[PDB]
Amino acid sequence: AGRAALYKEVYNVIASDGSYVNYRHMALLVDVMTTQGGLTSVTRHGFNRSNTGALMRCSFEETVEILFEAGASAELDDCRGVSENVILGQMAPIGTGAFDVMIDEESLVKYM
Amino acid sequence: MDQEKKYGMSITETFEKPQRTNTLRMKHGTYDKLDDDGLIAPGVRVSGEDVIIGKTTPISAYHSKRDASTPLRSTENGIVDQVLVTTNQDGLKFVKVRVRTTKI
């Protein structure tokens, strides 16, 4: 019910300028904001305090605090996000990088 | 603008046309338009990285002098109209040059 109320509030917010936004975007936003059992604010005290990678988290808010926290702990960054791959300069597993391309010998000998 | 600033006592820059014989790490711009005093006479067309003021500073193998010339701007060109030479408060040399261009 809280998620539905939040979606209705957002839809009412984008109602006066005349702009129309597809339901999928706002639904995704409110689902992200209510993934846990309560409201998750879009700020340093909301979605930030999560279990995601430290490198991807520390690129928006203050950085050295979370770096010190990571050093004090021993959490592992899976490097499956976009920010980590951008920092490491590798092809992020998004869009064209969501799959792998391999060559097969059977098809290679099939054509010729 | 340029100045004949002095380091210590004997390390004083001088205004002269630099030569390949005793100048190291010098700029690759043309020095043909320069004169003996190190300044371009008014009425000479300049363009690109051409050197307008020739200044060299003593190093302290030879190469006792190192260039400090200021070239013209990469995107600017024109004809020099007025060159001003005078002295600053302490007594060194003060040199000012001007470039005139028409923008259609």
Partner: protein
């Protein structure tokens, strides 16, 4: 001492060679690669047995260029000089520092400080060796030598030998 292990090798193939003969190309690549290798982890690779069902997996293409990385699976005979292991070889060289042994393809050194003072360097005899009592040892003669440890893990692989042990020398 001889072991056979299911080793793995990673190779990169240029796409200009992407023809029907890629399988045999990789086969000869592996063949000349692991033959005579001196890897410090596995040891000495002598022969590549089981030239069948190599099972060349699909070659992932690197995003940078058109090359493909292949992970070939194979088994081969390995040779590593395990420390503290008694082996038998033949004498090849004998300087004043000591007499070497020819256990396998290695150059195990029996330094003078290892075997007892009984062995003396007698240069009067035509083959320079360590002629002494308790049996005769010479160049190209049977000798059993123990291994103290492994050194120089990079580049060539060899060890150091000793004779000071009951029922170890002569034979």
């Amino acid at each position: 001492m001889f072991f056979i292990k299911d080793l793995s090798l990673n190779i990169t193939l240029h796409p200009s060679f992407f023809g029907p003969r890629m399988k045999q190309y990789l086969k000869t690549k592996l063949l000349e690669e692991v033959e005579g290798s001196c890897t410090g982890k596995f040891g000495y690779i002598l022969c590549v047995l089981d030239y069948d069902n190599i099972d060349i997996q699909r070659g992932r293409i690197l995003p940078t260029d058109g090359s493909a990385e292949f992970n070939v699976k194979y088994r081969a005979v390995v040779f590593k000089p395990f420390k503290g292991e008694v082996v038998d070889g033949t004498v090849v060289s004998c300087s004043q520092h000591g007499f070497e042994v020819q256990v396998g393809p290695m150059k195990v050194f029996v330094t003078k400080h290892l075997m007892p003072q009984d062995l003396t360097f007698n240069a009067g005899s035509n083959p320079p060796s360590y002629q002494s009592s308790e049996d005769v040892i010479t160049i190209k003669s049977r000798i059993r030598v123990k291994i103290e440890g492994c050194i120089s893990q990079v580049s060539s692989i060899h060890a150091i030998g000793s004779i000071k042990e009951d029922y170890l020398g002569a034979i």
